[PDB]
Amino acid sequence: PVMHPHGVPPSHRPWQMKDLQAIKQEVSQAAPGSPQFMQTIRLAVQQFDPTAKDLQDLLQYLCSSLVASLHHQQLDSLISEAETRGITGYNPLAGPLRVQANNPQQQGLRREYQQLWLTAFAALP
């Protein structure tokens, strides 16, 4: 999660097991892929403002290894397509998008990464 304390720069903090349990319960209160599901996962992403690594770690906790890998596969294709067209605040010279999305200061890029990560569920059966 990325914290936004008043005044000081934003900072990253690891998931707490209670955070992940809370998200798991909220998500499990809706059928996977359903409109209420996608709404719940999006609201959880808003709550914790996670980095790219945070999002990967969350799915690793929520889903089976192969299903989380399927998401990663779908997201990688979305990222490639997004990189071809250009992404807000992304210069390939500063490193891979997934790595840049882990810099707490790059909010605009993190938020766009979050939207791509959310979009990649559109395939998850």
Author numbering: 1 to 125
Task: List sentences from the manuscript.
Here, we show that high-resolution crystal structures of the mature-length HTLV-1c CA protein define essential lattice interfaces and identify a distinct ligand-binding pocket. Across the known Orthoretrovirinae, CA is a two-domain protein with HIV being the best characterised. However, our structures reveal that HTLV-1 does still have a pocket formed between helices 3, 4, and 5, albeit an electropositive one capable of binding to either phosphate or sulfate in vitro.
Interestingly, in crystallants at physiological pH, we observed partial occupancy of both sulfate and phosphate, while full occupancy was achieved under acidic conditions (pH 6 and below). Mutants that would remove a direct interaction with the sulfate or phosphate groups (H71A, H72A, R98A and W117A) all effectively abolished infectivity with a concomitant loss of particle production. In the HTLV-1 case, sulfate is unlikely to be the endogenous cofactor, and inorganic phosphate is too ubiquitous to provide any spatiotemporal regulation to the capsid but could potentially function as a ‘pocket factor’.
